[PDB]
Amino acid sequence: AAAMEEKTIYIAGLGLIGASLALGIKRDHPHYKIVGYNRSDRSRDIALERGIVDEATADFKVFAALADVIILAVPIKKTIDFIKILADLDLKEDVIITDAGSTKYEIVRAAEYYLKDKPVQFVGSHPMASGAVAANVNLFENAYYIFSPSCLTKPNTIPALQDLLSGLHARYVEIDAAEHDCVTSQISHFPHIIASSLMKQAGDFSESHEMTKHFAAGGFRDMTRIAESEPGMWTSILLTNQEAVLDRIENFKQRLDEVSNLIKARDENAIWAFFNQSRQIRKNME
Amino acid sequence: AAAMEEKTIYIAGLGLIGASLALGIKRDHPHYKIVGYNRSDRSRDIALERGIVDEATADFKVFAALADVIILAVPIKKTIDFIKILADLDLKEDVIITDAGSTKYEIVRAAEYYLKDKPVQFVGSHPMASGAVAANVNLFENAYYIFSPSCLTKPNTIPALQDLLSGLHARYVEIDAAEHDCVTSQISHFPHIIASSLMKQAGDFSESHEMTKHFAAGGFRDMTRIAESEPGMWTSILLTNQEAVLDRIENFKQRLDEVSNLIKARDENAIWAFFNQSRQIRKNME
Ligand SMILES: NC(=O)c1ccc[n+]([C@@H]2O[C@H](COP(=O)([O-])OP(=O)(O)OC[C@H]3O[C@@H](n4cnc5c(N)ncnc54)[C@H](O)[C@@H]3O)[C@@H](O)[C@H]2O)c1
Ligand SMILES: NC(=O)c1ccc[n+]([C@@H]2O[C@H](COP(=O)([O-])OP(=O)(O)OC[C@H]3O[C@@H](n4cnc5c(N)ncnc54)[C@H](O)[C@@H]3O)[C@@H](O)[C@H]2O)c1
């Protein structure tokens, strides 16, 4: 009777992520109704155009009570605002609510704080990959889709979303929200800080040393490519992952001081071991 | 009469660089004789095999006196050892001697110190791109070939090498040796330090946080790719470019402290400006 399952999914935010999720849902559940919220007119019209969503609104509340599942695909701060607004609406009995934040822990806390006395389910989501024009059914193919449980996640919450989202072709993973934030700090957020700091360093140096622009090669290009990212999103990741990111920055300063001491001592064997060991590690992840 | 020009070029070190240079020479000057030095037997035999060089030796002195041009393509410290040995040989009148070091300033100083009373010419070289098996006539195509003058560079030294090396299809550039070291510190050597420190950081973190290996994506891969490089060469670059590299490391620590202060203050507008400005700079080099 999978043919006959009915569902209304409300996606708030029809940017790249929200719209691509809509496309992944419809891919495996062609009969589910998708209803959309979006602030700006442009992304909302495209969405309506390409049958990505069946109805759309600029009033967040308008579709809330009707939804069997609500996915909040707006930035991190607005996700919390919308959680605040969902907390005093009369929503469907046991709606499953979820987000799509790059950082799990703060959003989960906000959900537990605001929704604890509502008959709702909540779980944190992070679909690990622009606007509704860049919408792509295959955005998440073979990428990890992370769930982070909350005290409002019931035994069936993750299973129901995993069924809902099967059309993404993602790899599902359950992980503690704080632990998620710790890991992604190290392999994504702090690297972005470094790439941005390095670009700014080299750019400052450039004004005073003209061959800088010209001698930069594949090494430098590759370590600065992610500097190109959107600053609103990176700012809210830093402000919602402060502790982990600060810890990485402080640990990285200590590592630079070890390297600087080795250079001052002209310690050739230690400097060699420093380069060799890292080379080996690289080869050993994978 | 370019048909009739005779020349003997002595290349010491038949690794990737020395052998590829030999191939680039023969490409435009098929009648020049190339004679080769190499320590280990393997790279020397390949070289003899593929007609990359016409004669070869494991005794550095054997070809020195005969050469019209000597190119030292061994590592940075051995280049200085060989400069020491060339200083008390009777070389051809006005031989042009040059190196291929990743760092110009120390090698140029050593040449001026050791060779000042010999009737020789010297100029520093850095052909900005493994062993004699990885030898490639096109290694340097459209890459910068740097010359750094010494008090032993005569008016015709750079012109004679530029003619000699035309088959590389490189882009010639003349730059002060110290200034070269300053620039390459910023866009290559210090980035390599950072990439190696970051890999080691993430690798240490990994042992204690298992999802690290799995969540690392294109961002992290790209900033750590050059960690894969050979530690002997990177060590001698650091030990011959100490001042510039230490200056970058100290300046980078100060930039991390600014970023860390912004995060602690939750200064959202400043953190945004920090990401946006770097994004713009990236776009503005090119
Ligand atoms: N882009 C990625 O690589 C990625 C990956 C995984 C998760 N995420 C998360 O998803 C969020 C959205 O990402 P996206 O790539 O869809 O960006 P996007 O720019 O394509 O879409 C952003 C959406 O949020 C809405 N919005 C922004 N500010 C708002 C506000 N003040 N009030 C009401 N609506 C507002 C927009 O109109 C738009 O619908 C991110 O901020 C991030 O936490 C992003
Ligand atoms: N590989 C690059 O990206 C690159 C680019 C430009 C310049 N350089 C410079 O050229 C040098 C050589 O680079 P390569 O890529 O040809 O490396 P390679 O490993 O392919 O060749 C190194 C050569 O040096 C010889 N050698 C090493 N130690 C020696 C010693 N102790 N005594 C006598 N001979 C010794 C080897 O037998 C071999 O011929 C580098 O160390 C660097 O300064 C390298």
XYZ file of C-alpha atoms and ligand atoms in Angstrom:
660
model
C 0.000 0.000 0.000
C 3.057 2.312 -0.376
C 1.230 3.537 -3.543
C -1.517 4.845 -1.065
C 0.549 6.598 1.584
C -0.457 10.271 1.975
C 1.810 12.885 3.565
C 2.155 16.675 3.710
C 5.686 17.864 4.112
C 6.235 21.511 4.899
C 9.652 22.877 3.947
C 10.433 26.363 5.267
C 13.166 27.960 3.145
C 13.361 27.126 -0.546
C 17.048 27.919 -1.151
C 19.468 25.318 -2.456
C 19.064 22.928 0.475
C 15.270 23.208 1.061
C 14.426 22.912 -2.655
C 16.873 20.051 -3.277
C 15.385 18.213 -0.321
C 11.901 18.757 -1.850
C 13.158 17.222 -5.106
C 14.634 14.228 -3.205
C 11.340 13.652 -1.399
C 9.220 13.722 -4.562
C 11.700 11.365 -6.205
C 10.702 8.443 -3.954
C 7.269 9.641 -2.870
C 5.588 11.169 -5.925
C 2.236 11.426 -4.166
C 3.352 13.248 -1.056
C 2.182 16.867 -1.053
C 5.002 19.397 -0.546
C 4.143 22.877 0.730
C 6.766 25.627 0.867
C 7.649 28.774 2.792
C 10.037 31.358 1.393
C 10.657 35.033 2.304
C 11.963 36.504 -0.998
C 9.690 36.276 -4.039
C 12.267 34.948 -6.491
C 13.134 31.535 -4.921
C 9.453 30.972 -4.156
C 8.343 31.488 -7.810
C 11.033 29.208 -9.230
C 9.943 26.578 -6.723
C 6.308 26.847 -7.788
C 7.434 26.783 -11.495
C 9.419 23.589 -11.575
C 6.797 21.683 -9.545
C 9.373 21.505 -6.730
C 6.580 22.397 -4.247
C 2.759 22.185 -4.800
C 1.865 25.320 -2.809
C 3.930 28.174 -1.422
C 3.633 31.097 1.046
C 5.525 34.102 2.486
C 3.732 33.584 5.787
C 5.519 30.912 7.859
C 2.453 30.073 9.990
C 0.156 29.406 7.056
C 1.155 25.757 6.447
C 2.403 24.794 9.953
C -0.710 23.098 11.461
C -1.332 20.935 8.341
C 2.136 19.381 8.059
C 2.965 15.775 8.971
C 6.678 16.733 8.737
C 8.252 20.174 8.925
C 11.814 20.725 7.727
C 13.428 24.088 8.556
C 15.926 24.912 5.800
C 16.589 28.622 6.605
C 19.795 29.901 8.261
C 20.779 28.852 11.730
C 19.315 31.873 13.588
C 16.093 31.895 11.675
C 15.681 28.128 12.362
C 15.618 29.003 16.098
C 13.169 31.915 15.455
C 10.896 29.475 13.607
C 11.225 26.907 16.455
C 10.090 29.698 18.824
C 7.042 30.303 16.550
C 6.217 26.607 16.167
C 6.133 26.219 20.030
C 2.933 28.272 20.410
C 1.084 26.915 17.342
C -1.381 24.039 17.478
C 0.457 21.606 15.177
C -0.696 18.206 13.967
C -0.520 15.471 16.577
C 3.061 14.217 16.536
C 4.366 16.240 13.610
C 8.073 15.386 13.086
C 10.098 18.599 13.056
C 13.671 18.821 11.824
C 16.251 21.362 10.709
C 19.215 21.255 8.280
C 21.826 23.245 10.209
C 25.559 22.937 9.609
C 25.926 22.821 13.411
C 23.765 20.465 15.488
C 24.179 21.318 19.185
C 22.672 24.798 19.573
C 19.670 24.020 17.375
C 18.921 20.845 19.331
C 19.189 22.702 22.592
C 16.794 25.369 21.275
C 14.320 22.703 20.199
C 14.418 20.989 23.620
C 14.022 24.366 25.369
C 11.084 25.595 23.314
C 9.152 22.481 22.347
C 9.482 20.249 25.408
C 5.743 20.534 26.349
C 4.362 20.128 22.873
C 3.190 16.767 21.506
C 5.783 16.967 18.673
C 8.840 14.970 17.646
C 12.157 16.653 16.950
C 15.509 15.435 15.669
C 18.449 17.522 14.419
C 19.509 17.020 10.764
C 22.580 18.061 8.785
C 22.441 16.993 5.085
C 26.144 17.454 4.230
C 25.829 18.871 0.669
C 23.613 29.181 -4.769
C 19.779 29.383 -4.408
C 16.427 27.676 -5.579
C 17.907 28.006 -9.141
C 20.831 25.822 -8.094
C 18.244 23.137 -6.899
C 19.394 19.618 -7.645
C 17.711 16.265 -6.919
C 21.151 14.670 -6.632
C 22.713 17.254 -4.298
C 23.070 14.779 -1.434
C 23.909 11.608 -3.408
C 26.496 9.582 -1.478
C 26.919 12.416 1.039
C 26.277 11.854 4.748
C 22.890 12.891 6.112
C 23.387 13.343 9.813
C 20.767 12.869 12.551
C 21.413 14.170 16.094
C 18.856 12.968 18.648
C 17.018 15.220 21.055
C 14.935 14.356 24.190
C 12.029 14.749 21.722
C 13.236 12.021 19.343
C 11.009 8.957 19.638
C 11.961 5.363 18.552
C 10.288 5.903 15.165
C 11.418 9.486 14.386
C 14.738 8.639 12.654
C 13.174 5.608 10.813
C 10.268 7.800 9.522
C 12.676 10.448 8.212
C 15.001 7.820 6.743
C 12.081 6.485 4.810
C 10.920 9.962 3.831
C 14.431 10.945 2.609
C 15.459 7.690 0.821
C 15.288 9.424 -2.557
C 18.322 11.602 -1.603
C 20.460 8.489 -1.895
C 22.420 9.740 1.113
C 24.328 7.787 3.744
C 22.513 8.067 7.074
C 24.499 8.571 10.252
C 23.411 9.128 13.845
C 25.731 11.155 15.986
C 25.588 13.151 19.231
C 25.121 16.900 18.452
C 28.097 18.168 20.500
C 30.307 15.433 19.038
C 29.153 16.396 15.530
C 30.093 20.025 16.292
C 33.509 18.905 17.575
C 34.236 16.887 14.458
C 33.041 19.402 11.907
C 34.986 22.161 13.701
C 38.175 20.243 13.009
C 37.628 19.123 9.453
C 35.540 22.016 8.133
C 35.013 25.110 10.262
C 38.542 25.722 11.490
C 39.976 24.866 8.074
C 37.694 27.608 6.657
C 39.158 30.064 9.229
C 42.572 29.096 8.185
C 41.880 29.408 4.465
C 40.324 32.861 5.025
C 43.244 34.073 7.265
C 45.813 32.777 4.800
C 44.085 34.572 1.800
C 44.003 37.795 3.785
C 47.635 37.374 4.829
C 48.851 36.692 1.275
C 46.568 39.550 -0.046
C 48.075 42.035 2.445
C 51.612 40.842 1.543
C 50.764 41.104 -2.144
C 50.285 44.922 -1.958
C 53.886 45.277 -0.899
C 55.478 42.364 -2.950
C 54.311 42.286 -6.493
C 55.365 38.806 -7.583
C 52.993 37.263 -4.962
C 49.989 37.270 -7.287
C 52.032 35.732 -10.063
C 53.976 32.975 -8.176
C 51.028 31.539 -6.325
C 50.542 27.985 -7.661
C 48.251 24.941 -7.214
C 49.343 24.573 -3.589
C 48.111 28.011 -2.661
C 44.969 27.941 -4.862
C 43.865 24.713 -3.138
C 44.309 26.025 0.286
C 42.386 29.088 -0.330
C 39.486 27.870 -2.533
C 36.950 27.640 0.356
C 37.715 31.315 1.204
C 35.269 31.868 -1.595
C 32.325 30.780 0.623
C 29.274 32.810 1.756
C 30.035 34.917 4.889
C 26.493 34.873 6.504
C 26.507 31.104 6.722
C 30.182 30.940 8.006
C 29.545 33.587 10.609
C 26.577 31.767 12.153
C 28.588 28.485 12.164
C 31.337 30.187 14.138
C 28.919 31.879 16.541
C 27.093 28.591 17.177
C 30.300 26.463 17.472
C 32.500 28.829 19.551
C 34.119 26.421 22.025
C 35.259 23.781 19.548
C 36.547 26.375 17.027
C 38.391 28.385 19.709
C 39.932 25.132 20.965
C 41.230 24.320 17.503
C 42.624 27.785 17.037
C 44.480 27.685 20.361
C 45.810 24.148 19.625
C 46.932 25.295 16.202
C 48.857 28.241 17.732
C 50.739 25.778 19.988
C 51.561 23.598 16.935
C 52.892 26.689 15.102
C 55.080 27.559 18.175
C 56.584 23.958 18.087
C 57.350 24.440 14.382
C 58.748 27.912 14.969
C 61.038 26.591 17.764
C 62.327 23.878 15.482
C 63.211 26.393 12.761
C 64.963 28.714 15.296
C 66.954 25.762 16.607
C 67.860 24.709 12.949
C 66.789 21.250 14.090
C 66.977 19.485 10.782
C 66.081 15.953 11.979
C 63.014 17.207 13.915
C 61.842 19.321 11.026
C 62.194 16.339 8.692
C 60.225 14.122 11.171
C 57.598 16.861 11.242
C 57.111 16.744 7.458
C 57.353 12.942 7.187
C 54.900 12.128 9.907
C 52.183 14.367 8.397
C 52.779 12.904 4.950
C 52.269 9.442 6.467
C 49.016 10.519 8.264
C 47.552 11.901 5.079
C 48.229 8.557 3.348
C 46.721 6.812 6.445
C 43.327 8.588 6.427
C 41.426 6.747 3.631
C 75.171 29.440 -38.075
C 72.949 28.305 -35.142
C 73.191 24.847 -36.831
C 77.019 25.061 -35.996
C 76.998 26.190 -32.379
C 78.872 23.741 -30.112
C 78.353 23.592 -26.342
C 78.999 21.198 -23.450
C 76.509 21.476 -20.665
C 77.270 19.674 -17.440
C 74.244 18.860 -15.287
C 75.038 17.592 -11.785
C 72.059 15.650 -10.414
C 69.878 13.685 -12.810
C 66.667 13.564 -10.743
C 63.400 14.970 -12.035
C 64.646 18.546 -12.387
C 68.181 17.901 -13.767
C 66.980 15.316 -16.314
C 63.969 17.382 -17.421
C 66.262 20.354 -17.911
C 68.550 18.124 -20.048
C 65.534 17.180 -22.181
C 64.555 20.876 -22.556
C 68.080 21.778 -23.655
C 68.307 19.040 -26.293
C 64.877 20.058 -27.560
C 66.163 23.385 -28.928
C 69.851 22.546 -29.231
C 70.096 18.994 -30.579
C 73.835 19.284 -31.148
C 74.855 20.471 -27.715
C 76.662 17.750 -25.767
C 75.125 17.028 -22.344
C 77.270 15.360 -19.680
C 75.765 14.186 -16.390
C 76.694 13.594 -12.761
C 74.588 11.407 -10.498
C 75.357 9.689 -7.155
C 72.962 6.682 -7.190
C 73.309 4.197 -10.048
C 69.632 3.976 -10.968
C 68.906 7.586 -12.109
C 72.242 7.663 -13.928
C 71.481 4.509 -16.008
C 68.003 5.680 -17.001
C 69.559 8.967 -18.080
C 72.140 7.213 -20.244
C 69.346 4.925 -21.648
C 66.915 7.490 -22.936
C 69.684 9.604 -24.515
C 68.878 12.276 -21.906
C 72.652 12.768 -21.383
C 75.534 11.655 -23.708
C 77.984 10.713 -20.934
C 77.589 10.213 -17.202
C 79.726 9.883 -14.032
C 79.538 9.279 -10.253
C 82.557 11.526 -9.795
C 81.477 15.193 -9.702
C 84.911 16.552 -10.704
C 85.232 14.434 -13.825
C 83.262 16.714 -16.192
C 83.733 20.099 -14.432
C 86.703 21.594 -16.377
C 85.186 20.744 -19.809
C 81.785 22.392 -19.322
C 80.721 25.666 -20.956
C 77.710 25.697 -18.570
C 77.267 23.851 -15.291
C 73.814 23.452 -13.762
C 73.637 22.115 -10.188
C 70.366 20.201 -9.801
C 71.053 18.395 -6.467
C 69.477 19.412 -3.130
C 70.131 22.769 -1.580
C 72.967 21.681 0.764
C 74.726 19.597 -1.805
C 74.553 22.541 -4.283
C 76.656 24.540 -1.771
C 79.054 21.556 -1.283
C 79.489 21.405 -5.069
C 80.038 25.212 -5.225
C 82.798 24.712 -2.613
C 84.365 22.019 -4.876
C 84.026 24.074 -8.063
C 85.920 27.013 -6.377
C 89.260 25.156 -6.332
C 88.981 23.515 -9.782
C 90.460 25.002 -12.940
C 87.225 25.466 -14.918
C 86.818 26.668 -18.488
C 87.340 30.386 -18.959
C 84.032 32.025 -18.082
C 81.949 28.906 -17.537
C 78.388 29.965 -16.569
C 77.407 28.224 -13.339
C 73.852 28.027 -12.052
C 71.716 26.112 -9.578
C 68.004 25.164 -9.441
C 67.223 25.753 -5.761
C 63.726 26.395 -4.438
C 65.275 29.210 -2.371
C 67.578 31.767 -4.011
C 69.257 33.862 -1.297
C 71.505 31.427 0.586
C 72.756 29.738 -2.581
C 73.629 33.088 -4.156
C 75.443 34.164 -1.040
C 77.406 30.889 -1.046
C 78.340 31.384 -4.689
C 79.561 34.958 -4.067
C 81.528 33.795 -1.001
C 83.254 30.857 -2.661
C 83.686 31.857 -6.292
C 84.417 35.584 -6.102
C 88.082 35.195 -7.268
C 87.426 32.731 -10.034
C 86.966 33.791 -13.667
C 83.435 32.269 -13.709
C 79.908 33.605 -14.120
C 77.166 32.732 -11.663
C 73.444 33.429 -11.516
C 70.835 31.809 -9.250
C 68.022 29.840 -10.967
C 64.705 28.452 -9.743
C 62.746 26.563 -12.471
C 59.323 26.497 -10.758
C 58.147 22.977 -11.767
C 59.660 11.677 -8.482
C 63.098 10.918 -10.054
C 64.940 10.496 -13.511
C 62.011 8.124 -14.390
C 59.580 11.004 -13.925
C 61.729 13.071 -16.462
C 59.594 15.202 -18.734
C 60.601 17.602 -21.532
C 57.495 19.669 -20.794
C 57.931 19.899 -17.009
C 58.485 23.659 -17.078
C 56.083 24.626 -19.896
C 54.408 27.938 -19.030
C 55.945 27.867 -15.541
C 58.192 30.691 -14.332
C 61.944 30.167 -14.580
C 63.462 32.556 -12.104
C 66.907 34.192 -12.316
C 68.416 35.929 -9.255
C 71.551 37.945 -10.039
C 74.797 37.677 -8.132
C 77.899 39.977 -8.145
C 79.203 37.326 -10.586
C 76.391 37.793 -13.123
C 77.707 39.571 -16.212
C 75.552 41.471 -18.811
C 75.401 38.359 -21.014
C 74.883 35.640 -18.357
C 71.049 35.763 -18.200
C 70.758 36.180 -22.043
C 73.055 33.128 -22.620
C 70.990 30.964 -20.257
C 67.715 32.253 -21.700
C 68.901 31.146 -25.078
C 70.182 27.837 -23.733
C 66.857 27.117 -21.940
C 64.368 28.314 -24.628
C 63.234 24.739 -25.250
C 61.659 24.618 -21.733
C 59.013 27.014 -22.998
C 59.144 28.710 -19.598
C 58.402 32.307 -18.655
C 61.638 34.028 -17.636
C 61.661 36.356 -14.657
C 64.480 38.238 -12.948
C 64.056 38.884 -9.277
C 66.238 39.761 -6.275
C 67.097 36.565 -4.293
C 65.906 37.812 -0.875
C 62.706 39.151 -2.446
C 62.156 35.786 -4.160
C 62.572 34.069 -0.768
C 60.087 36.502 0.806
C 57.475 35.863 -1.855
C 57.786 32.103 -2.011
C 57.673 31.925 1.805
C 54.219 33.471 1.689
C 52.662 31.625 -1.204
C 54.418 28.263 -0.902
C 56.619 27.528 2.098
C 54.408 28.773 4.908
C 51.318 27.297 3.254
C 53.155 23.927 3.304
C 53.761 24.388 7.074
C 50.161 25.094 7.549
C 48.970 22.128 5.500
C 51.338 19.820 7.428
C 50.275 21.225 10.879
C 46.606 20.970 9.972
C 46.978 17.265 8.816
C 48.763 16.442 12.053
C 46.140 18.284 14.097
C 43.205 16.544 12.385
C 45.116 13.161 12.565
C 45.652 13.556 16.335
C 41.968 14.542 16.788
C 40.912 11.598 14.642
C 42.276 9.026 17.166
C 39.862 10.344 19.745
C 36.849 11.253 17.439
C 36.054 8.568 14.974
C 33.838 10.410 12.503
C 36.774 12.747 11.608
C 38.142 10.435 8.922
C 34.704 10.008 7.424
C 33.381 13.640 7.439
C 36.442 15.235 5.934
C 35.379 16.605 2.522
C 36.827 18.462 -0.505
C 37.623 21.490 1.654
C 39.898 19.523 3.923
C 41.427 17.318 1.180
C 42.471 20.463 -0.727
C 44.093 22.062 2.179
C 46.098 19.114 3.046
C 47.160 17.743 -0.380
C 50.665 19.339 -0.302
C 51.281 17.609 3.080
C 52.071 14.723 0.808
C 55.390 16.339 -0.263
C 58.971 15.056 0.229
C 60.365 15.986 3.698
C 64.125 16.336 2.748
C 63.362 19.050 0.238
C 60.879 20.895 2.607
C 63.306 20.769 5.486
C 66.144 22.406 3.545
C 63.716 25.100 2.256
C 62.776 25.949 5.826
C 66.379 25.926 7.052
C 67.476 28.186 4.183
C 64.448 30.568 4.438
C 64.173 30.913 8.255
C 63.493 34.644 8.656
C 60.708 34.967 6.096
C 58.970 31.740 7.241
C 59.211 32.668 10.944
C 57.801 36.103 10.087
C 54.812 34.534 8.372
C 54.203 32.173 11.239
C 54.270 34.985 13.808
C 51.985 37.175 11.618
C 49.610 34.263 11.203
C 49.425 33.769 15.004
C 48.404 37.445 15.384
C 45.706 36.981 12.691
C 44.386 33.907 14.558
C 44.272 35.959 17.839
C 42.147 38.685 16.025
C 39.780 35.946 14.824
C 39.690 34.317 18.243
C 38.852 37.686 19.901
C 36.024 38.230 17.466
C 34.508 34.824 18.251
C 34.824 35.416 22.050
C 33.131 38.789 21.654
C 30.320 37.158 19.476
C 30.995 40.058 17.121
C 28.798 38.991 14.271
C 29.337 42.021 11.982
C 33.152 41.822 12.340
C 33.185 38.103 11.740
C 31.056 38.579 8.625
C 33.429 41.366 7.386
C 36.291 38.958 8.033
C 34.798 36.285 5.752
C 33.595 38.733 3.079
C 36.813 40.625 2.703
C 38.853 37.432 2.138
C 36.313 36.156 -0.370
C 36.704 39.449 -2.255
C 40.566 39.231 -2.184
C 40.530 35.736 -3.592
C 38.344 36.953 -6.487
C 40.744 39.956 -6.849
C 43.986 37.964 -7.299
C 43.776 36.829 -10.973
N 25.053 25.454 1.407
C 25.587 24.463 2.112
O 26.844 23.968 1.732
C 24.882 23.833 3.310
C 24.974 22.455 3.555
C 24.260 21.886 4.604
C 23.458 22.664 5.451
N 23.395 24.011 5.232
C 22.523 24.863 6.104
O 21.312 25.272 5.434
C 21.122 26.695 5.532
C 20.494 27.202 4.241
O 21.437 26.892 3.245
P 21.211 27.108 1.643
O 22.457 26.585 0.985
O 19.827 26.646 1.283
O 21.365 28.715 1.403
P 20.475 29.572 0.351
O 21.091 30.915 0.266
O 20.369 28.929 -0.984
O 19.014 29.649 1.069
C 18.777 30.417 2.257
C 17.269 30.500 2.520
O 16.982 31.105 3.774
C 16.064 32.208 3.593
N 16.381 33.260 4.591
C 17.619 33.820 4.826
N 17.508 34.723 5.819
C 16.226 34.736 6.234
C 15.566 35.491 7.212
N 16.226 36.462 7.857
N 14.189 35.291 7.403
C 13.465 34.361 6.642
N 14.149 33.628 5.678
C 15.494 33.817 5.474
C 16.170 32.664 2.115
O 15.176 33.558 1.502
C 16.470 31.293 1.474
O 15.279 30.555 1.352
C 22.514 27.277 5.867
O 22.555 28.594 6.468
C 23.222 26.136 6.629
O 23.045 26.151 8.039
C 24.088 24.592 4.170
N 60.661 18.846 -7.176
C 60.337 20.132 -7.238
O 58.983 20.490 -7.158
C 61.378 21.235 -7.407
C 61.109 22.363 -8.197
C 62.097 23.319 -8.404
C 63.366 23.199 -7.820
N 63.617 22.117 -7.024
C 64.974 21.949 -6.411
O 65.751 20.928 -7.071
C 66.283 19.987 -6.122
C 66.286 18.599 -6.747
O 64.931 18.329 -7.012
P 64.376 17.012 -7.802
O 62.887 17.193 -7.890
O 65.253 16.760 -8.996
O 64.495 15.789 -6.728
P 64.915 14.270 -7.115
O 64.662 13.439 -5.917
O 64.196 13.751 -8.307
O 66.513 14.386 -7.413
C 67.475 14.640 -6.380
C 68.888 14.423 -6.932
O 69.887 14.822 -6.005
C 70.819 13.739 -5.783
N 71.287 13.793 -4.375
C 70.493 13.858 -3.249
N 71.284 13.913 -2.160
C 72.567 13.902 -2.572
C 73.776 13.921 -1.865
N 73.763 13.862 -0.527
N 74.980 13.876 -2.589
C 74.998 13.812 -3.990
N 73.780 13.793 -4.661
C 72.595 13.828 -3.969
C 70.102 12.421 -6.177
O 70.835 11.159 -6.362
C 69.221 12.973 -7.317
O 69.991 13.118 -8.484
C 65.415 20.142 -4.853
O 65.978 19.677 -3.603
C 64.938 21.610 -4.905
O 65.788 22.544 -4.253
C 62.643 21.139 -6.826
